[PDB]
Design a protein around this ligand. Structure first.
Ligand SMILES: NS(=O)(=O)c1ccc(C(=O)NCc2ccc(C(=O)c3ccccc3)cc2)cc1
Ligand SMILES: [Zn+2]
Length: 258
């Protein structure tokens, strides 16, 4: 009985195996744009993915991860609310069964069709495992997806999904440039939060971009053809793999713009 997104193992059940699910710094959250405040202390955000080295794509039973070689200082995120350098380790998405839902963070309660998470770990901690035990160990850059025009840079990911349809399947995925998934503007909101899936660790500095990228209906439809199940098991489409907004509690969301 593993955690998941169904009626009997979904978000409302996670707290039993992962008590921190009812913690003081859980993610995602609804971003109330009128309550968020411009923060002059934020430094310019720097996304440097020019030397990014992708290696593989994997269906892990809850989403698919495009993994990167993070043994060297390549794709890094710095600046903004961050102190130091954070290295890109993987990206994945959360999406819905319908275009009207799918994102984890919401903006004035608005839900987008999907949300991309580019996961980075603080290099002061040596590696990802050590980083996820620190309060400033990770930085996740979140980007909303809306359905409209296709995103050319996403097509390479879409086309390989046929080969990793079920849980446990992986496929070589080299030379993918994540710069092709970024919107024009880097305006963002930021707040201290957590991993949005078990173990739900509270080690993340969230940076959520205000401008969503557009993807076509055809592209998101292919995301929805993936399976939560393993090969040869009853088919459960991989849709609605998002956690709903959690209590903001004692936190303030800061904006990088006025
Ligand atoms: N959706 S999100 O961007 O917030 C998000 C990002 C990344 C992971 C993730 O990496 N989960 C897998 C994982 C693997 C190992 C450890 C780990 O080393 C550890 C586990 C429990 C306690 C201490 C460390 C933690 C998470 C989960 C969610
Ligand atoms: Zn995620």
């Amino acid at each position: 009985h593993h955690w998941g997104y169904g009626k009997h193992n979904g978000p409302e059940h996670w707290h039993k195996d992962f008590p921190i699910a009812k913690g003081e710094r859980q993610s995602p959250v609804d971003i109330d744009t009128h309550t968020a405040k411009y923060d002059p202390s934020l430094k310019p955000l720097s996304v440097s993915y020019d030397q990014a080295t992708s290696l593989r794509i994997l269906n892990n039973g809850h989403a698919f991860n495009v993994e990167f070689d993070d043994s060297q200082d390549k794709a890094v995120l710095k600046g903004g609310p961050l102190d130091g350098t954070y290295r890109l380790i993987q990206f994945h998405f959360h999406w819905g069964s319908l275009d009207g839902q799918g994102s984890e963070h919401t903006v004035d309660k608005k839900k987008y069709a999907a949300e991309l998470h580019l996961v980075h770990w603080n290099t002061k901690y040596g590696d990802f495992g050590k980083a996820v035990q620190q309060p400033d160990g990770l930085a996740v850059l979140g980007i909303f997806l809306k359905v409209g025009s296709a995103k050319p840079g996403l097509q390479k990911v879409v086309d390989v999904l046929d080969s990793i349809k079920t849980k446990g399947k992986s496929a070589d995925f080299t030379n993918f440039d994540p710069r092709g998934l970024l919107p024009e503007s880097l305006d963002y909101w930021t707040y201290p939060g957590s991993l949005t899936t078990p173990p739900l660790l509270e080690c993340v500095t969230w940076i959520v971009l205000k401008e969503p990228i557009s993807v076509s209906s055809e592209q998101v439809l292919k995301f929805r053809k993936l399976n939560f199940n393993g090969e040869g098991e009853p088919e459960e489409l991989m849709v609605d793999n998002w956690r709903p907004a959690q209590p903001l509690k004692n936190r303030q969301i800061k904006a990088s713009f006025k």
